[PDB]
Symmetry: D2
Subunit: 334 residues, 4 copies
Amino acid sequence: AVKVGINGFGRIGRNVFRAALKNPDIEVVAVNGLTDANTLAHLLKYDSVHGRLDAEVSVNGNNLVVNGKEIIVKAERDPENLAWGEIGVDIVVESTGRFTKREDAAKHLEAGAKKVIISAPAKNEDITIVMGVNQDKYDPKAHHVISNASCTTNCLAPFAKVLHEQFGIVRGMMTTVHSYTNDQRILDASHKDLRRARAAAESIIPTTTGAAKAVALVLPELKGKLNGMAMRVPTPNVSVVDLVAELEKEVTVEEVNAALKAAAEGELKGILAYSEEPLVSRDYNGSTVSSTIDALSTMVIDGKMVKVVSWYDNETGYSHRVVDLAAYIASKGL
Amino acid sequence: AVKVGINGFGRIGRNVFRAALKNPDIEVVAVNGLTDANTLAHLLKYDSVHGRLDAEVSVNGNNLVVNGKEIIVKAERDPENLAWGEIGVDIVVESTGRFTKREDAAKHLEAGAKKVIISAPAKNEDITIVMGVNQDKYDPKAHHVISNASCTTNCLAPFAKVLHEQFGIVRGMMTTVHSYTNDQRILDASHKDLRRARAAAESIIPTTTGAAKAVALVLPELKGKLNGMAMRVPTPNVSVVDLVAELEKEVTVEEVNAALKAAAEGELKGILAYSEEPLVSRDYNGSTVSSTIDALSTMVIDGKMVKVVSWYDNETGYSHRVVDLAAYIASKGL
Amino acid sequence: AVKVGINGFGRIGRNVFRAALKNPDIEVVAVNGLTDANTLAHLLKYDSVHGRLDAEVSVNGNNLVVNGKEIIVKAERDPENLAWGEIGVDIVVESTGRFTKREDAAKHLEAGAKKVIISAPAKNEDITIVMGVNQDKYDPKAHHVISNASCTTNCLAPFAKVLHEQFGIVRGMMTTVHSYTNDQRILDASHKDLRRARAAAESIIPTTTGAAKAVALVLPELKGKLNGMAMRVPTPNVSVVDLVAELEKEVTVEEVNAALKAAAEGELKGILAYSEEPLVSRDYNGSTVSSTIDALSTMVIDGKMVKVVSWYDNETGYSHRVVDLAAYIASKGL
Amino acid sequence: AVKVGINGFGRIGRNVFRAALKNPDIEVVAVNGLTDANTLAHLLKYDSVHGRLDAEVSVNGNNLVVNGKEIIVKAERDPENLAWGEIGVDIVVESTGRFTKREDAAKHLEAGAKKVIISAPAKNEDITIVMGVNQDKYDPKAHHVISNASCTTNCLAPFAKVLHEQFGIVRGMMTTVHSYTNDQRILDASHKDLRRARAAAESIIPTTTGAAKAVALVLPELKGKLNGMAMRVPTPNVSVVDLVAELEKEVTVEEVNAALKAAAEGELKGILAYSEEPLVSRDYNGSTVSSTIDALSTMVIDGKMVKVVSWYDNETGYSHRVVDLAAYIASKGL
Ligand SMILES: NC(=O)C1=CN([C@@H]2O[C@H](COP(=O)(O)OP(=O)(O)OC[C@H]3O[C@@H](n4cnc5c(N)ncnc54)[C@H](OP(=O)(O)O)[C@@H]3O)[C@@H](O)[C@H]2O)C=CC1
Ligand SMILES: NC(=O)C1=CN([C@@H]2O[C@H](COP(=O)(O)OP(=O)(O)OC[C@H]3O[C@@H](n4cnc5c(N)ncnc54)[C@H](OP(=O)(O)O)[C@@H]3O)[C@@H](O)[C@H]2O)C=CC1
Ligand SMILES: NC(=O)C1=CN([C@@H]2O[C@H](COP(=O)(O)OP(=O)(O)OC[C@H]3O[C@@H](n4cnc5c(N)ncnc54)[C@H](OP(=O)(O)O)[C@@H]3O)[C@@H](O)[C@H]2O)C=CC1
Ligand SMILES: NC(=O)C1=CN([C@@H]2O[C@H](COP(=O)(O)OP(=O)(O)OC[C@H]3O[C@@H](n4cnc5c(N)ncnc54)[C@H](OP(=O)(O)O)[C@@H]3O)[C@@H](O)[C@H]2O)C=CC1
């Protein structure tokens, strides 16, 4: 229903396009990338991780045709030259990873767009929203350049919000055993992060994460109470968060799990999910929720230190949340 | 000079042999497996994880000849029929993974060996030892079936000791991101643990570990103070411990790091290591220590919550421990 | 209609089941393994390669329930004690990998079955059949212990048949760059084959194959004309046969490609397929045909030496042909 | 003795460096990249595939100090601004993959160098040399910009030369099951070759090669009698060539294998090795030789068709021939 555009047709760009296909409220009408329509059609149809797209994918001239609907293809590397206004696009998904500072992503608004959602942590964005945690603090008048946050922050927040509401977190650390991404190297090559410079499918690669910090942007009362690290491992997709927190109240594994299960059926249905099954990561590939509690891994020590473990498909769940935010923003009118 | 017999020439047994060649104090004279000498020489000679053995390996009759010395090869399924006496083996390394209970491991004693080291956590053993932490508590008169704990416990124990001795650990949670081992499956197949039943090279597989609780055997005062889990990921060797604990005292990163570094250069030299280089797991493949602190990852929240990260080559570090334990026992006079 | 029993609920055993679920002409009524119904149930439901089973899988005591249907779960490691005769089973799929010699597979007949399908190259079988190539030679009154050959032979026989009737093969050699299977080791371990004893997910492993001479069994015209090898590589599923051959006739890539495409659209429809898309292995995961020609890879040198590349999902394509042979055999009287 | 400069400090540039350290005739005095000295020295020091370099590496100013010798680090994205002449560099190793047209490679000569070796196949290069095959055609007067060929052409040419010399090649096809390289993609991303645009570690990926045809640039008699393709698999290093040739004379495996053994221990020692061991890829990681015949894989059909399989560590063997060629050039006069 609401016209949308995707700048940067990559892992997240193509996955948002795939998710958009089932949302009614929105309609992706144009996409921009650095490649031709034929490459774009191929990468869109066949995916190593997500499989063959189930739709009629074709190319007419330099315009994609998916299930009969024509999508316009651009190759304008400079975001102010896209002309979103010429084609009616109201929402633009910024997923190139290059325009995360508000002044750059703002170029889309220059080009005619009304709202810009950045699929990554940002700088000086008008607002940071994690669906299920603070979409409500959104104002159509004041927020135009919204950050959807990171995939890691999307997994953690929802169940950090419950844990906090319920038992209260005094402090905690998280580690995300995360699959590799396109920001890494196939074989030892230059990278600013000397660890990410190393062969991705060959080692456990410790790296930084600002996801633990970022959650304070959506859960202010958790400011200065969390921190953590990341460990990129040799799987192509699906990651897991392992949170160890000291709470204010005294609990047991059973009360902690009952709490998460309740939210998963209540307020966070669709965002937070609860699994009591002993699954592995390849089983979460295709998961649309942002966070699935591995109930079997919950642990308590001294009645005050919990260990919660959550799964998340960094591409599918996050892409879906981009679609959700898009459609939510659109419903608040613009 | 002390004759060593190895039962179960697999990953730990072969590596223990490899490590044994570097130490003259002991002499491996016998090895028991369930294949021919020819299959053993090849598997000993070519290692996918560690590379070719630097030494002459040959097959004479059905005994191995490594650097001219002939090693007796046995094919006794039943430990009771090994006759370690007939050939003078003094210490036996029990590395089959099948005889971790006193009932079975003791069969080696009844068969003529004086001491047995189980290269894994055991049941009803005379004593559980982690070198550098409590070997001093070994009693040559009272202890015959010795357990050398697990590779995880060996990693965490030596630094847990430091943090505790000098700071005080109220409570802690751990996660070891572990390479996969031969107890897993290449493709989905039957397994007691439905998690380790899944294709090892394809997923991040959460599983259990008694390592955390096993620290209490070697460090009695940390009984019931720490607990944890594991996450098997797609790498062939090298693992890492992630400990998150609450100290008695309020420290800083530098504070913690100073203590671990000091310990490694003095107290726990050769056992505990300290690294300030941003390395990846592959870099630790071949490392002989038990624990190398990834100093760039030490982290503190509030001054009370610490996160320390430590690398350990699960096969090489551990096997050099088995060799050091076997040399220490023998020094107490068999 | 026909009632089926599966002996060895392995990768092939469970994928044959998944395939059968869709077919009304057959009916899986019981499975045997070396584990409990709860383990089999979980393995049948979550697959690391093919994903979750879209059906209702549950347990009823010791029995499996799948979509309202009850499947008998046994755990008899000796075919002699299977009693298929008692439960009404007509066709038994022998997919353990341990009973491929008539002397062992015929036990199923003695146990009351009417036909046995060996899911691998057999010894002293009654007939080896490659659907599409020679199921026509199947005699219902004479053949009862049937071999469905190997996944590689099922890939190769279809197009070698076509090229041979079309231009006639004079001699050729093939290599199957194959995915690793459960017959290999995770990390270096004992194996009847020292190539296969090496860490599977770590190297390109040359190994032997009987698939190319086995072809002679279904197309005797090609006896002593073909030969070949295999190289197991680090992918969990999907393989590709590489055939280079000397032709009786001089041809063009374009002629060779036209023959193959015609056979796929006509005679060999559903077994031999043809593609002109620039695809990779992950793309053929789920494929039901036995052999898919990668036309872009087709080459010709001197108009006499050709090269033909074909894909095959070693688990799915092969699992579907077992079901196909099951229904064919059935229809011919049982 | 002869001062060398390396341009492009990548997998091939750093490996040539490791090689060069161990060669008395050459001396790398300078390297040019596109990143800071510290990033370069960490990449040189730790290698995920080859290990920790045994030599003291440090960064004195913007220069690298290796084993006491200071190496000049430049960061000129443009060849002619390199001033190789000022610092007295005679031979420049071109390993960026960007200056393969003799016109671009000539810019080094513009900048003061006397000779340029392109570590890849070139366009309009002066002479293409494969060590052991045609280094004798090098003319110190006529040749300035020289191509060392590709790792694949270096594996194929030496045994093709032997086969055609002893038996005579009527024609043949080849396939190099090759490891992935930096020109590939981590996860599905834009690429000129749609096969290479796919996740490198996840699939078997069929691609094209110039190798088989490029053989004629070293062995002209073989012009037109060869062609092949490539298949990159999920291994980080070490490749294998699989040639099936229709020979002129009727031979036996023993005869094909005897001729190869002779040359390996005679005329081509150092370049062609011969193995009768059942080895796998990981075993050739670090081989300096250009081609090792897997004697066990040698097979022949109809007395005229043969298949010979050869291993080659694509980074190390090739990096050792560049140094070799460099040293041979130095010997002929600069
Ligand atoms: N992968 C994941 O798990 C997640 C990633 N993200 C974030 O999303 C962003 C992109 O990541 P991801 O999709 O993973 O990576 P990709 O590299 O797969 O996607 C980035 C895309 O941007 C395209 N691109 C670059 N510049 C332009 C341009 N100027 N105009 C048009 N297209 C352009 C690139 O095209 P080309 O390839 O031609 O260079 C590429 O297709 C980053 O901010 C990342 O941190 C957030 C959550 C999850
Ligand atoms: N892998 C690692 O990183 C570490 C492992 N451990 C422990 O070490 C032990 C071995 O593990 P790992 O080395 O990985 O396993 P492996 O599976 O590689 O080796 C096990 C060996 O035991 C042999 N074996 C089994 N039964 C017998 C028997 N009855 N008589 C003689 N030989 C026998 C096997 O022969 P065959 O192969 O023919 O079946 C096999 O080589 C386990 O207890 C494990 O928990 C502890 C620390 C680290
Ligand atoms: N995988 C492939 O790509 C293909 C394999 N094949 C052939 O299929 C056959 C099966 O192979 P695959 O599916 O890969 O292997 P798996 O190991 O997964 O399956 C073998 C099944 O055999 C079971 N089994 C072993 N002994 C018994 C017994 N005595 N009684 C009951 N069940 C038993 C195993 O149980 P458990 O694991 O609990 O011990 C397992 O469930 C082999 O002949 C193989 O050559 C043919 C085409 C394709
Ligand atoms: N890899 C192998 O197995 C083999 C490769 N080759 C050939 O070697 C060449 C490079 O291969 P490989 O090492 O694999 O690739 P890499 O990408 O690892 O190396 C490319 C190197 O060149 C650098 N670079 C790029 N442009 C410039 C520039 N303008 N000035 C200075 N430095 C530059 C890159 O730096 P940066 O990373 O910061 O961009 C990088 O260090 C190619 O021609 C390849 O075909 C030949 C035999 C074997």
